[PDB]
């Protein structure tokens, strides 16, 4: 039977799912690690023990324990990111969509969800892999990993909570895909890992980590890169946050062993209730438990690894969205609200920059403000709002990715860069937020192909070409069918294309002006002062 | 006789001069101080002792001793600034052009020449006051003052070379004009002092100095302001330069008395031959002997005087030229030459910024470079050349004047601001230099009215309206005839007009973007680092 597959871990039985008036097979909720519960909370994952019998993989698995957004109860723009299954620490499962009839050896794509390292689920409607698997004939896998304290609490030097275990969950799932995907018809020699925001940073982290490199062939990074300022902390800051979490829960803080044992007796929700209390600054776009530069998963600093070429050399395809910062200003900066145009006063602009670059002294804050203020028209509300949107997006997503791409390209085997700037016709968020962080995903997963979702015909065509670029790149290392050509991004030319409903345009040096400020000048400034 | 005038210092006999097919009287070379020679070199000026008999004022006086430009021997663009009379330390004289028939009590304008405080003459063809005096019926005076070491060598605490004596020469001439101009038909209650570059800085210095304020009514500042970074030094730097000058001449340096006595035995040319050797840095737009912040002529720092309103409150008219920096890049920055288009490489650009902001550390130099570089096109020769031209002009002339005008306007009684951007049709300098520092003067003095000078009819009309704005402002405190109106510059609106052959346009906040960088951000940066 097409729905029965035997893997090195045991037999698995899938389910047939309808897709665009056709059908494909789905194997949902395949376990790839032992549940990380009880004394295993905070520990590195252990491989799933093989099972006899047939594992029922007909339904989505639980989602990992996480902070649930309740800012706009029932609003679809925000609930589309919230867990849609029950949450459980028993959440280490993967999902596979397989074309029908089963391929023999085809292109594999493995999705790594984002969520700021503190949230996320592989089961969201926006990550439904049936459209992509069906339309491009690829075996599509979505993995899962622990987020928040459960995946990233770090007490470096302790083997009970070493940090980075969420990244190790991802690696374990990639090892399982490497060892078993051939049974589902996937070609393990051709696995492309792809992810957005924290998922895109994770993808770049596996490109860097010696221990992950061999598990995949090629990589796609959407609005995220490993060097993002919010994506990792030092072992001292990780330790400090872990100690502060224990302090919020009245834990004995005398030793790592005491702290961890106390943290392990708390119910999941007790940790999540105080998670946000451990941030060191009043800030925006900063999350509590994230990857740690440990000297193990990451042998040295990310910058020295990038500079010395200490990373997997292969082809990468990556890019950013036009207004990466809006989501974060809406949720925490003064002056922004969901139901108004959010024109920002000069004062709220200034308090917004302070929240945006929490690690900056006053000279640094003045430098940012001068860089983004039109002084011939400093009280312009739209300009202050949009300028702050650019500050947040440039500092947190765009310039870190441009720095990653110029460093990578020096040693890599091929880079394709995009700038996604299409505002979906059916977006439920306000106009002022523009092309929001995360809103290219629905195009990558082919949602515009389903009529009931209300996209335009040009949006369906945009989705079809993005999926075909993504799969052709996964298959060959080049998004172009051997029609308008997406040129290679090179060190000298730095070309990239716009991704939207208009005829392809090629440009060069994506936001160079602002990124020289964020990547070269500001750090020199903060370091000197 | 119309050419005979009796003054409190004695009788003076002038000469009749032809002007635009008419005639006026000129009283040239009237002494206003005792020759500052021998033991009087470096000392404050002494008033001219009255004389019996008739002083022959029919011919131009000698020019003060100064460094003579020999970069382009015989080239008119540069020789028009060089002394055109013999040089002598006996050079403290003033010139007066008087309408014919002699007015009874008319508007007086007193010109203070520029020359970086190290050169300049009241007798240059470009400062011929007959056209302005004739066309606008004003009594036009040009004074003179010691420049270079002779006017500004400063050993604060010594009464033999206290510094600022060149400014005291100007003040003495203003005192003479106040006490005697009524005999020439001028109204001493209505004297407007006007000057360009170092002359415009000098004008702002008399507006600030308690001891000069009462000697005039109103002021015009062209491309110069008192707070220019090149226009003054501290008493410690003045002392250091004075000591270094003595060191270049093998002087005994044991005491001020020893140093001064040695400097007084040197011929004028011996001091000038080593003058440039005392600058502290490799720089551009910095001159050896300039005004000193002494606690006497200037009671406290210029900034605190500006901030507290410690200055004459009256009406001022002032402005800048479009390419103030070109003259200085031509003369010393690498890559610039008189006979080429001077497209500048990225490297020469960087060495140009280092020369331009000599007092800056590396972080400061990076800030300037990032502020003026188009990073999407950093190897563009024209852009690098023009960007450096703007850096030099903004740092040395434009932003210091904008800072002066916004501070002044808070306490003053009326401000009119202009931006002069007409490139004269007969300019002999290359096209790349644009609207050069000093090239609005010929329009202010009405040179375009003389046909043989080859200006266009629209340039003659531009000259006529500038002279009429200048004289009407001198007469009433408002350049407008009680036709298009030059609006008042106010703290809130900051309006200014373009001055050129096109129909008047009004704009606001002259180069605000760049001047926030030069006046607020960079100094905070240099102060913190
Ligand atoms: C760096 O990429 C991300 C960080 C957070 C998220 C995402 C990210 O990518 C986004 C697109 C996709 O990858 C998945 C999740 C998204 C969208 C959904 N959501 C939840 C709704 C938006 C939240 C914005 C952050 C504000 C967060 N926030 C709190 O909710 C909060 C509660 C209490 C104290 C402090 C805070 C706080 O600062 C969060
Ligand atoms: C701040 O306004 C000025 C500073 C200098 C001058 C003027 C200024 O206003 C200009 C217009 C008007 O007011 C009068 C003079 C002008 C034009 C005529 N000129 C002479 C020719 C241009 C000189 C440019 C400065 C380079 C100077 N220079 C030397 O010549 C030199 C010799 C030896 C060592 C070092 C140097 C050096 O640095 C000099
Ligand atoms: C990616 O790597 C391949 C293989 O190493 C490169 O192809 C080689 O290109 C050189 C030219 O410099 C040829 O001499 C070799 O014969 C090629 N090898 C093969 C097997 O084709 C390719 O140029 C690289 N691509 C990029 C974008 O760097
Ligand atoms: C310059 O000063 C004059 C005189 O001090 C100002 O005129 C006065 O304006 C006030 C209005 O605030 C009137 O109440 C007075 O009666 C005016 N005095 C006279 C004698 O006219 C004038 O406003 C000032 N101009 C500027 C541009 O500041
Ligand atoms: C698999 O699980 C689903 C839902 O839990 C159930 O309805 C289905 O019948 C199961 N299949 C088998 C054979 O266990
Ligand atoms: C599509 O449009 C209909 C009618 O305009 C609306 O009621 C419906 O909720 C929309 N459906 C979705 C899934 O966006
Ligand atoms: C004034 O001086 C000039 C030139 O030195 C001379 O030609 C003229 O005759 C003099 N006038 C008198 C009366 O001294
Ligand atoms: C004016 O033009 C003539 C002929 O073009 C030229 O020879 C002369 O030198 C110019 N005169 C001046 C003073 O510029």
């Amino acid at each position: 039977s097409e729905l029965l597959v035997n893997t090195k871990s045991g037999k698995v039985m899938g389910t047939r799912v309808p897709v665009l008036s056709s059908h494909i097979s789905a194997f949902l909720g395949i376990p790839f690690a032992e549940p990380p519960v009880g004394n295993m909370r905070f520990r590195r994952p252990e491989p799933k023990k093989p099972w006899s019998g047939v594992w029922n993989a007909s339904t989505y698995p639980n989602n990992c324990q996480q902070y649930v957004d309740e800012q706009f109860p029932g609003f679809s723009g925000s609930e589309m990111w919230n867990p849609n299954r029950e949450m459980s620490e028993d959440c280490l499962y993967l999902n596979i969509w397989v074309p029908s009839p089963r391929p023999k050896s085809t292109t594999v794509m493995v999705w790594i969800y984002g969520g700021g390292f503190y949230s996320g689920s592989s089961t969201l409607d926006v990550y439904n892999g049936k459209y992509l698997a069906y339309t491009e004939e690829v075996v599509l896998v979505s993995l899962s990993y622990r987020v928040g304290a459960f995946g990233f609490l770090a007490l470096h030097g302790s083997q009970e909570a070493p940090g980075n275990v969420g990244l190790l969950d991802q690696r374990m799932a990639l090892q399982w895909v490497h060892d078993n995907i051939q049974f589902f018809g996937g070609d393990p020699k051709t696995v492309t890992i792809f992810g957005e925001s924290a998922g895109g940073a994770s993808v770049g982290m596996h490109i860097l980590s010696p221990g992950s490199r061999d598990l995949f062939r090629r990589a796609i990074l959407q609005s995220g890169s490993p060097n993002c300022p919010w994506a990792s902390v030092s072992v001292a800051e990780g330790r400090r946050r872990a100690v502060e979490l224990g302090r919020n829960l009245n834990c004995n803080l005398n030793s790592d062993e005491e702290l961890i044992h106390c943290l392990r007796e708390k119910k999941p929700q007790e940790l999540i209730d105080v998670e946000w209390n451990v941030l060191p600054f009043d800030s925006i776009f900063r999350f509590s438990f994230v990857p740690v530069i440990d000297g193990e998963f990451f042998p040295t600093s990310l910058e020295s690894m990038l500079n010395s070429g200490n990373f997997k050399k292969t082809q990468i395809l990556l890019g950013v969205n036009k207004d990466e910062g809006s989501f974060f200003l809406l949720y925490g900066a003064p002056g922004f609200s969901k139901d108004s145009e959010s024109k920002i006063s000069r004062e709220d602009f200034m308090s917004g920059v302070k929240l945006s670059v929490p690690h900056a002294n006053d000279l640094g804050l003045d430098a940012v403000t001068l860089q983004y203020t039109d002084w011939m028209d400093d009280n312009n509300g739209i300009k202050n709002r949009d300028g702050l949107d650019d500050i947040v997006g440039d500092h947190n997503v765009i310039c870190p990715l441009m720095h990653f791409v110029n460093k990578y390209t020096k040693f890599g085997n091929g880079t394709y860069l995009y700038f996604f700037n299409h505002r979906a016709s059916n977006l439920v968020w306000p106009e002022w937020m523009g092309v929001i962080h995360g809103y290219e995903i629905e195009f990558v997963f082919g949602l515009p192909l389903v009529k009931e979702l209300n996209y335009t015909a040009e949006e369906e065509a945009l989705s079809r070409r993005i999926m075909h670029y993504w799969a052709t790149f996964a298959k060959t290392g080049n998004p172009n069918e051997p029609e308008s050509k997406w040129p290679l991004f090179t060190t000298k030319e730095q070309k990239f294309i716009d991704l939207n409903t208009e005829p392809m345009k090629v440009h060069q040096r994506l936001r160079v002006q602002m990124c020289v400020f964020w990547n070269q000048f500001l750090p020199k400034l903060l370091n000197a002062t």
Side-chain angles (χ1 to χ4, degrees), chain A residues 122-188 190-346 348-409:
Chain A
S122 60
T123 63
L124 305 187
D125 298 336
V126 253
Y127 305 152
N128 195 335
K130 81 193 193 176
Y131 310 103
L132 182 52
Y134 173 73
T135 308
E136 297 288 328
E137 302 173 294
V138 299
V139 159
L140 192 110
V141 179
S142 55
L143 50 73
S144 63
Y145 59 99
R146 283 169 284 169
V147 291
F150 315 85
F152 297 95
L153 179 100
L155 286 164
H156 184 64
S158 157
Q159 288 313 313
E160 297 298 329
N164 293 335
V165 303
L167 285 163
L168 291 183
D169 295 342
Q170 296 173 16
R171 173 186 296 172
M172 191 144 102
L174 293 181
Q175 181 74 64
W176 195 93
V177 165
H178 189 262
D179 298 343
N180 295 285
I181 209 64
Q182 66 197 68
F183 303 115
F184 297 82
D187 172 6
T190 312
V191 55
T192 290
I193 56 175
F194 74 129
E196 185 271 350
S197 186
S202 293
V203 165
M205 281 169 176
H206 290 302
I207 280 167
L208 290 159
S209 189
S212 288
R213 299 179 196 175
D214 304 358
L215 302 182
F216 63 94
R217 174 66 168 276
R218 199 159 272 149
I220 295 174
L221 298 77
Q222 300 161 214
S223 302
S225 66
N227 53 314
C228 288
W230 49 271
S232 65
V233 292
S234 62
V235 298
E237 174 59 12
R239 161 161 299 279
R240 193 217 123 229
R241 293 182 191 190
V243 173
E244 190 61 17
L245 187 72
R247 191 181 278 115
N248 269 266
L249 302 168
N250 305 302
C251 286
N252 181 304
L253 312 184
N254 290 163
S255 65
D256 283 355
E257 312 78 277
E258 289 278 15
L259 176 52
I260 290 169
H261 175 274
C262 172
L263 292 184
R264 286 183 176 153
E265 289 314 294
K266 300 304 175 163
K267 300 274 82 152
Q269 195 52 40
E270 297 178 79
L271 266 34
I272 293 166
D273 283 344
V274 296
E275 171 182 339
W276 293 101
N277 300 343
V278 306
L279 286 180
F281 308 115
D282 185 4
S283 62
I284 241 98
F285 223 123
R286 290 301 185 264
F287 316 110
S288 291
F289 300 99
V290 295
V292 277
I293 304 306
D294 57 349
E296 292 166 45
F297 192 100
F298 301 105
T300 63
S301 69
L302 302 185
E303 188 56 20
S304 60
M305 288 186 69
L306 287 175
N307 276 323
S308 65
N310 188 356
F311 52 79
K312 189 191 176 68
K313 298 173 180 71
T314 180
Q315 307 75 38
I316 56 166
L317 182 154
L318 79 171
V320 302
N321 290 359
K322 164 89 163 316
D323 306 285
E324 306 281 24
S326 62
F327 223 142
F328 309 84
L329 288 162
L330 166 58
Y331 278 58
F336 297 81
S337 340
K338 186 168 85 49
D339 302 346
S340 88
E341 266 185 24
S342 297
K343 293 175 187 163
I344 298 306
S345 68
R346 196 63 206 155
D348 279 345
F349 179 81
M350 283 186 311
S351 89
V353 347
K354 170 64 169 48
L355 251 16
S356 296
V357 195
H359 57 289
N361 50 24
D362 289 2
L363 181 64
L365 296 173
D366 288 346
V368 173
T369 295
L370 172 54
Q371 189 80 181
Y372 284 88
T373 298
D374 173 349
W375 296 104
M376 311 200 65
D377 191 20
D378 59 303
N379 289 305
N380 186 143
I382 302 316
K383 285 186 179 169
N384 291 340
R385 178 195 77 201
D386 296 342
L388 202 34
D389 192 346
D390 284 331
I391 282 168
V392 178
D394 293 342
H395 167 60
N396 291 295
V397 180
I398 303 183
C399 297
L401 186 144
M402 291 314 299
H403 180 64
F404 174 72
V405 76
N406 276 289
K407 289 308 193 172
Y408 189 86
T409 297

